[PDB]
């Protein structure tokens with residue numbers, strides 16, 4: 001397979017390193033932030049459909065599924081939102097893009113708490129509070145399915161995805177750190193959704209393992 005490797009823009013690499021090295025204890029915020037991103041992407045495709053019905057030809061269901069897998073030590077968050085083209089995937093996760101990253105990095109100096117990370121438009125990276133590696137698989141109506149992945153360290157890879165086709169949307173696979181497996185426990189995931197997410201205008205379904 002063809003794999004491209006990219007460097008994160010410096011400020012994002014710096015942010016990632018701060019997140020990976022922190023003992024910040026309220027790590028459950030990652031779920032609120034990823035669900036929020038899914039909801040924003042769901043809003044995007046749904047808006048586009050008001051004007052163009054064929055936008056949902058790739059899938060009419062608009063929802064978010066949470067899939068813990070204890071055997072694989074992964075928690076997967078899948079949404080059927082607008083997805084990302086390859087260019088937007090690289091831009092949105094590899095650079096400051098539209099975010100307040102610089103202000104956030106100053107806010108951290110000033111000693112603010114990273115729970116404000118989502119208000120600075122960089123909530124995705126909180127995933128690194130709980131994951132050693134994150135894979136993002138995405139399919140936008142205007143492009144092919146791509147898999148982005150990073151274990152931090154300053155780089156990430158993007159490759160065309162040969163996995164199960166998603167009709168449209170984004171799937172985030174969190175390869176959890178050894179000491180963060182509480183997020184694969186059904187009781188914990190339920191408790192967290194309600195505290196940081198029962199505000200979302202889309203169905204959020206937790207798949208219980210058999």
Ligand SMILES: CCc1cc(-c2n[nH]c(C(=O)O)c2-c2ccc3c(c2)OCO3)c(O)cc1O
Pocket residue numbers: 034035036037038039040041042044079081082083084088092093121124136169170172
């Ligand atoms: C990896 C982060 C993430 C992104 C998306 C997503 N899909 N499409 C888009 C889009 O704007 O086109 C996004 C998305 C959602 C929130 C964002 C974002 C992209 O960049 C900053 O904040 C998503 O649906 C879920 C996610 O967790």
